[PDB]
Design a protein around this ligand. Structure first.
Ligand SMILES: OC[C@H]1O[C@H](OC[C@H]2O[C@H](O)[C@H](O)[C@@H](O)[C@@H]2O)[C@H](O)[C@@H](O)[C@H]1O
Ligand SMILES: OC[C@H]1O[C@H](OC[C@H]2O[C@H](O)[C@H](O)[C@@H](O)[C@@H]2O)[C@H](O)[C@@H](O)[C@H]1O
Ligand SMILES: [Ca+2]
Ligand SMILES: [Ca+2]
Ligand SMILES: [Ca+2]
Ligand SMILES: [Ca+2]
Lengths: 338, 338
């Protein structure tokens, strides 16, 4: 169904309403459990009138986990001290989450905790969490436990080992929404010897995976001194800090061809813009695009620098000022939580 | 270099200045030659200040030929009574055309004739023809005779068998620039029982071959009752005949993503638009797009129906009224010569 949602400020999945769950082989919530691998399933149905588009996921585990969405493996992680961020495109009405958790220390606690923030076509969103509504088994995961087509109608409920505020684990640290390590500060080639002239500069990067279906994009960005961000010609947002980064979700990507454009301005001295972009596809894979030398850049901004299709003849390759961590900006950027 | 050339009316390549050439084993022009296969090469260099983009080609032979451009085989044909159309993308400055011709009847004349109309980045055009400036050999085509890297500086000239007006062959008929045969008359789904309401309708078809580099597109189009054609949102032209088809060349295609849009109007009774589109890629292949059900269509034309990227949500599949040749329009369209 029709997608009304427009680019907006990124909205985090939070763990404070989720519960730790496990099988209940030991009925003491948070008691000791054996080394084992156990399966967990959760079905979700769109409310009448709207279609689910994509999801933001934070997951932590004692001890480890493997995360599937509609049968596609989307991540593996471990540890209860820090959560792990995942992004996945969804089907319009029915969606299946499946986690294979592992207890790797004998006679130790066990549990998985996840928060799934589901975004709908009209712009609203709903948080689903780990709780007793997840199915589980008191045995190792059968073949294809993660496929929607496996029948779990008779599986028992998962057993809650503890709420977010409990006496066993404590609040897991939320990861950054997206990493900047691996992205680069870029600018036009008039940035030389640590400084750049005063004024504005434009940057383009197009993503065109013609055999896949693009769905959602998450964007983390910062610039010295300020920026405005456009996707397919539409304004997403603006910022003016090179010490506090901004994050946006773009829920209306064109399905095959999308162009991100930046208009960054230098107020004086050093200049630079840095961004990490993650696009989710309908097949369950995703793509990370960073600011680097493949971005196109220009010093005199033509009118219509932000439309998707333009003649990129007079544009240069963006110059890399430095990988994230370079001076003066350093490694201390404040990054929104996933 | 920068492409200034804009959409324009298609310009036919003509044979009227080209000559029949062969090896000269028999020194009498147009005389008898033996059953054999013989090679022909021709180099072209772009004039100063402009870059060569693509070429339209008509070729005929006594008796048969295989046609290569920069080593890529692009067609095979035969016969001196009617010429054969080819379309190929070119490299900016140097290009090598090579033909392996065959005489298949003993003690019979032999000759190949070609006209190559090259279009430059600025919109100008120049015709290269088969003549004595082509290299040949008095032997079978060596291995890799068609590669640009093969050395022909010591090869002898080809021998002219006759001009366009000569006493052996006579003027070969020019083929249609493109076939309409195989394309379909399409319309919106309100066209039923041989008629459709009065009014305007919109149609879109996108070509996005993301691993190739698109260069030129040639378009053949007609409509009942009239149409206007757009490429990437830019106007190409308009026409108003279902008995006379129009041909355009588009020399400024975007290299990866191009959207064709038509706004057609029906004045009453039967309605339909039909088009064949040929796109050339830098690797020497081409792609033919025809009007069919994969075009998107809509009955109320939204503003911005012709921009490349739009939300194609409310658009239906185009309805096929019939393959070319169906009544009322019949098989008699007047089609520009290649
Ligand atoms: O380090 C990059 C930054 O350098 C210049 O601004 C630095 C400012 O840092 C502190 O805010 C300090 O209080 C100020 O006095 C100082 O100007 C430059 O103006 C910025 O555009 C940016 O390149
Ligand atoms: O066959 C399609 C054609 O049908 C209608 O054509 C009728 C008119 O055609 C000639 O213009 C003739 O001179 C007129 O006498 C005759 O009324 C329709 O009008 C056309 O738009 C077209 O659909
Ligand atoms: Ca444990
Ligand atoms: Ca600065
Ligand atoms: Ca012959
Ligand atoms: Ca009509």
């Amino acid at each position: 169904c029709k997608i009304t949602a427009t680019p907006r400020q990124f909205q985090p999945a939070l763990l404070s309403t989720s519960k730790w769950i496990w099988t209940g082989e030991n009925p003491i919530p948070g008691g000791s459990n054996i080394i084992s691998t156990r399966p967990f399933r959760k079905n979700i149905t769109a409310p009448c009138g709207k279609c689910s588009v994509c999801a933001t996921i934070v997951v932590a585990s004692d001890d480890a986990h493997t995360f599937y969405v509609n049968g596609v493996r989307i991540g593996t992680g471990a540890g209860f001290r820090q959560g792990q961020a995942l992004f996945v495109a969804l089907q319009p009405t029915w969606n299946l989450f499946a986690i294979a958790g592992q207890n790797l220390v004998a006679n130790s606690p066990a549990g998985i905790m996840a928060s799934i923030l589901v975004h709908f076509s009209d712009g609203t969103s709903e948080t689903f969490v780990t709780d007793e509504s997840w199915k589980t088994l008191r045995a190792a995961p059968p073949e294809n436990f993660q496929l929607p087509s496996t029948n779990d109608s008779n599986w028992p409920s998962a057993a809650v080992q503890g709420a977010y505020q409990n006496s066993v684990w404590g609040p897991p640290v939320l990861p950054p929404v997206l990493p900047l390590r691996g992205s680069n500060w870029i600018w036009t080639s008039d940035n030389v010897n640590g400084a750049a002239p005063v004024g504005s500069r434009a940057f383009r990067k197009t993503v065109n995976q013609c055999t896949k279906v693009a769905v959602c994009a998450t964007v983390l960005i910062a610039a010295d001194d300020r920026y405005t961000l456009y996707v397919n010609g539409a304004t997403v947002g603006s910022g003016s800090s090179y010490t506090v980064a901004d994050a946006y979700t773009i829920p209306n990507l064109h399905p095959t061809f999308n162009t991100f454009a930046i208009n960054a301005t230098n107020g004086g001295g050093p200049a630079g813009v840095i961004a990490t972009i993650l696009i989710t596809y309908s097949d369950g894979s995703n793509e990370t695009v960073v600011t680097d030398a493949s971005w196109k850049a220009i010093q005199t901004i033509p009118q219509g620098f932000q439309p998707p299709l333009i003649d990129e003849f007079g544009w240069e390759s963006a110059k890399i000022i430095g990988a994230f961590g370079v001076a003066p900006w350093g490694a201390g950027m404040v990054i929104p939580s996933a």
